[PDB]
Design a protein around this nucleic acid. Sequence first.
RNA 1: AAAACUCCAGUUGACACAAAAUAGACUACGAAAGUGGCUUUAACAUAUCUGAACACACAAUAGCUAAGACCCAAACUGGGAUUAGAUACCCCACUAUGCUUAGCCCUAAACCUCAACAGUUCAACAAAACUGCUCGCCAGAACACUACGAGCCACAGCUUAAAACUCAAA
Lengths: 116, 86, 97, 45, 136, 23, 107, 96, 122
Amino acid sequence: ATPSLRGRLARFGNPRKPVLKPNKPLILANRVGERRREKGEATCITEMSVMMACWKQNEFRDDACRKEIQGFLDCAARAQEARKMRSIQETLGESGSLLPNKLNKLLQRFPNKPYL
Amino acid sequence: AKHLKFIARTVMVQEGNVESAYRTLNRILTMDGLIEDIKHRRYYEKPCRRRQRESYERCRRIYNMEMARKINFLMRKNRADPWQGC
Amino acid sequence: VESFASMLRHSPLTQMGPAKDKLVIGRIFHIVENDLYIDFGGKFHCVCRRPEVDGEKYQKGTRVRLRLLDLELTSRFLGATTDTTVLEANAVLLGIQ
Amino acid sequence: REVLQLQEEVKNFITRENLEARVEAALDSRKNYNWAITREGLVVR
Amino acid sequence: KFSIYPPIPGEESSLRWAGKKFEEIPIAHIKASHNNTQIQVVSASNEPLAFASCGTEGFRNAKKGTGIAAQTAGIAAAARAKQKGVIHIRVVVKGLGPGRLSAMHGLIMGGLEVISITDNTPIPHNGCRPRKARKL
Amino acid sequence: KNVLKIRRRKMNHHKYRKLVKKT
Amino acid sequence: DPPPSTLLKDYQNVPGIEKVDDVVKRLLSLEMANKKEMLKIKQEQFMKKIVANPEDTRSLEARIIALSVKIRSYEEHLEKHRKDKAHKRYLLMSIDQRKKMLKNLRN
Amino acid sequence: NEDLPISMENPYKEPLKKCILCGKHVDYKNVQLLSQFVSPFTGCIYGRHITGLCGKKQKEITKAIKRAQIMGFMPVTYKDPAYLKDPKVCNIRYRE
Amino acid sequence: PRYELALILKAMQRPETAATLKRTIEALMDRGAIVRDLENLGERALPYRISAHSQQHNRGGYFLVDFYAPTAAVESMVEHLSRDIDVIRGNIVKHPLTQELKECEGIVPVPLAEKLYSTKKR
RNA sequence: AAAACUCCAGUUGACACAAAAUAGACUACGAAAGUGGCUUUAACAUAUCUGAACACACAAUAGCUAAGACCCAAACUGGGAUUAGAUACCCCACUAUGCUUAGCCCUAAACCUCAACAGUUCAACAAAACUGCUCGCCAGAACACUACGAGCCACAGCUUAAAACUCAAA
Ligand SMILES: [Mg+2]
Ligand SMILES: [Mg+2]
Ligand SMILES: [Mg+2]
Ligand SMILES: [Mg+2]
Ligand SMILES: [Mg+2]
Ligand SMILES: [Mg+2]
Ligand SMILES: [Mg+2]
Ligand SMILES: [Mg+2]
Ligand SMILES: [Mg+2]
Ligand SMILES: [Mg+2]
Ligand SMILES: [Mg+2]
Ligand SMILES: [Mg+2]
Ligand SMILES: [Zn+2]
């Protein structure tokens, strides 16, 4: 249920102070905002941590901690492939709902009418 | 401080999924608006700005809920073109 | 000669009363992939998904039974002066005959 | 009706002559104001 | 079957963790500030068992306010709790800094077992006025 | 609207408060 | 000042009053009641003492007696609660409103 | 003329929707019902969009909750664990 | 008017509990009250540690005193309860069953605001 | 980052004269200012309307006088950063001040810049266009929230409020 707009704005005839002060006229646009990007991640940090622990506990010798090293490299490879998969996934289809461009096509077929 | 020490905001881990438990904890705090309260009460917000913010958020809620009623009301007509060549 | 007031009073869309939850027979008149474009009388057509059970007994001309939730399906939004009609009614397909 | 309803009720009021017996009766009794509502508007005592 | 809600101290509770009920499992407290994360392990009767933090583990100034620093501090605190004999732990976090889950992960990597997560972050019901907003 | 008239009156007021302090 | 042992207006016409127990007399008296009820009685007593037909409640004289009771109440308040500026406005507005009705009856 | 319509107040008019507590007496001693309209983990009073109470009832439940918690009847920061078992009437969903 | 006294008393035994209930009710009638009823909501754990009269209380016995008192007696009753060291928390309210319940026709639906902006092109 | 603190930090327990999460997606009360923790008492003018800038009563914040309170915040000030400088923005510390009581001072972009009462359905932007009636105000820019006079518990104050010179625009 949408919050009401009955006596919330500063209008003629309203006996009240304005509840809301909208900086833009509260009318639905024919547009939907574009999809925001994802942000910084800092991936592979935990494995990098486990790798660098071995190094300082073992005079910085790789042959000492091959398994931790391999964990860091495989986390890096999986992170890169996750990046590629996620890029192609967000290009392919938005999860659950529809793409902003196609929703804008829909809103262009049934436009808002603030006039008469 | 004067309540019972381990009931409030307490989630239990299941099987060993601590990640399915912290995410849950952050979700109750987000859903009850605790997290945004902490972020907003790190620095004092002067009451003029309190009113301006809490009016912009309410106008945003009204507008967002209206485009959502419109997007759902018209997602039925996103069916294939019934008369392709007009 | 019957007057339009008589035509209306004794008519079946004026004896139906409130359309919600009233069972109505309709005829498929167009099919796109699996969207069956049916009628039921009324000003608008309803569009229903193809029921996968018996999913070949739904062709152009088949008489089906519908629940009916609405007859026009419209709504006014934030800045609108008029309603946003979808030019389609709303019904749930129960089955055939 | 209000006056007559109040008349019948004053006979059961705590006085100086009723105090210890009524205190002990209260100490043996228990009233529960707790009740829960359902999704349907029905009380589940 | 499973409950997110914890056991009420005064009641029957079939859930156990190596003999101990819910109320005698030791408690790890993680204060997660914007510049530091401090983890202290105490017993159920408040006997200190382990205390580690980013400044303790070596990160000096602004590198303290990182997830890796809280992970290292959690590993060290879990190590000292293991030498004091602690396996199971109930985690209480106070704050919203970078290293909250990082300190939790540091404790699990160090080898302690988390059974409950509590959040005691201070929220006044409008008490003391905070600092002025920065003109950053 | 801009605040240019307000700016002129603001600068007028500042110079006055400085004269009363100075004299 | 009506005595604390007086009886509420709504209840002062109930046929069984002198036989009721003293606890019931105390319970519907003015001791165990509020100040707004003393003012109803002071407005009907003053009513019986001044006006012709105390059953109009729509006349100039009746309206002056009603405003005059609020003015004593606004005055009695402003004597304990001295810094109550809101009720000081009501009193001074009401002293002014009595004075107006008074004039129109004088004329 | 006989089949022309006639002025009447709307039949098929559904009776107005009523609130879960419409006609019941909210009391501050009823910490079993007040607890239902609070949050299990934080004790946060729920809004209208979760409770589904009318304005009169959201006001009476809020005032009774505040009265009981300052009077020593209700916990402030949690829902008394004894009541995390009663009939749920609130439209909220924490677990997944 | 009619008042209700919500009284959280100390966790005690029967003779001391009868003694303090007697003390409070005699204080009421000495202040000029006609007491209606005594109720025992019962002894339970407190929602929080109420510290009163140099003690830290964890449990308490909940009682109700329904009474009538003059308008100028509630303050003296509050002072007496504040000085009683067996009372954990006493609070006097106007009795709820003196406010009459209004009939609710139901939830009157609210529409979408209209004529909030002009019909210019814009 | 430095300076600062290490009479420090974490858990726990005692503990306010400060401030009032959530509710609040509610739109209420008040003349305006303003009012959102709980309880109680008192209490929210006018059975036409308009009307005091010759009156009376109020009026956020800041400020003054006197006596108290002290968690936190913080003009000023000092220290540390920055910079060409940095009397700033960033960090740390601390005061006047914010609180209470008593008295002043009487100002705000005190603006929803949209007067009260009664009624109706197009310059541009903005919050569609008007009718009756009444009061208040306004008449190129700047000089000018200024000078002078008067009044005022105000004495670096407030209200009221010009003119000369200049311009052909604002
Ligand atoms: Mg604007
Ligand atoms: Mg240093
Ligand atoms: Mg205070
Ligand atoms: Mg007038
Ligand atoms: Mg005036
Ligand atoms: Mg300070
Ligand atoms: Mg100070
Ligand atoms: Mg002032
Ligand atoms: Mg103006
Ligand atoms: Mg006027
Ligand atoms: Mg000025
Ligand atoms: Mg001047
Ligand atoms: Zn209702």
